[PDB]
């Protein structure tokens, strides 16, 4: 938080709009319908992946 607060106070990037949801339009509804769906790190962004939706590992 200290890192982020200072980086953004000086670069004027305190608010970073999310361009995309953590789920794609293709995976949106399985994410909605899976209570155990949770984002994971991919391409340095927290997003939903097809492997982690309706997975036996989560249950």
């Amino acid at each position: 938080t200290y890192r982020y607060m200072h980086n953004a106070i000086t670069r004027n990037t305190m608010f970073v709009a999310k361009d995309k949801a953590p789920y794609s339009d293709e995976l949106e509804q399985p994410v909605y319908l899976d209570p155990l769906a949770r984002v994971e790190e991919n391409k340095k962004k927290l997003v939903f992946s097809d492997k982690t939706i309706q997975s036996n590992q989560s249950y």
């Binding site: 995309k20 949106e28 909605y32 319908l33 899976d34 155990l36 249950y59």
Partner: protein
């Protein structure tokens, strides 16, 4: 309980109610599938059976009555009349609350902790109703191109995810055709 106590006309049971948001966007008025979460469940169950829940609650109630008897016996050891009255009221209220919490867990909130049981499915199953027992879907039905498409899509997908029998559509009420849209 209160409705029965006052004898008001019980028109229906609000088995479920929920609200949801859609996603990142730049369109405020655009509807979305956010309320599809009300039918969320994991597929990758005796809790859905009521006889199992009923026997669970039965022996929980017998444990509660044993607890009540023990507490009254201890109170016997413990203005003697006023003290006994107050503590007997307490034991009765506490046993009633243990019973109520047991009934809440096993008949009302049995599905809040089960991912495999969706909110909608478990709200219906609290009254031994399957998804097929949802006969009518009072649609928002705003006569809008995006709204009636998206809404039908989410209702259909939630019915399909809830394992509704094929050939068992929900009837769509579109009361706004007559009443307009407030």
């Amino acid at each position: 309980d209160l409705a029965l106590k006052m004898g008001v006309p019980i028109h229906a049971v609000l088995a479920m109610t929920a609200t949801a948001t859609d996603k990142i966007g730049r369109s405020v008025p655009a509807p979305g599938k956010g309320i599809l979460t009300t039918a969320r469940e994991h597929h990758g169950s005796p809790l859905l059976n009521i006889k199992y829940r009923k026997r669970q609650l039965n022996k929980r109630l017998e444990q509660i009555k044993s607890w009540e008897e023990t507490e009254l016996s201890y109170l016997q050891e413990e203005s003697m009349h006023e003290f006994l009255k107050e503590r007997t009221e307490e034991v009765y209220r506490e046993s009633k609350r243990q019973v109520s919490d047991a009934k809440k867990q096993w008949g009302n909130s049995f599905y809040k902790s089960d991912p495999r049981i969706a909110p909608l499915r478990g709200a219906l199953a609290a009254f031994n109703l399957t998804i097929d027992d949802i006969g009518v879907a009072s649609f928002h039905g705003t006569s809008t191109v995006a709204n009636d498409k998206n809404e039908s899509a989410t209702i259909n997908n939630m019915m399909k995810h809830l394992g509704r029998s094929e050939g068992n559509p929900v009837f769509g009420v579109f009361q706004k055709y007559l009443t307009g849209h407030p």
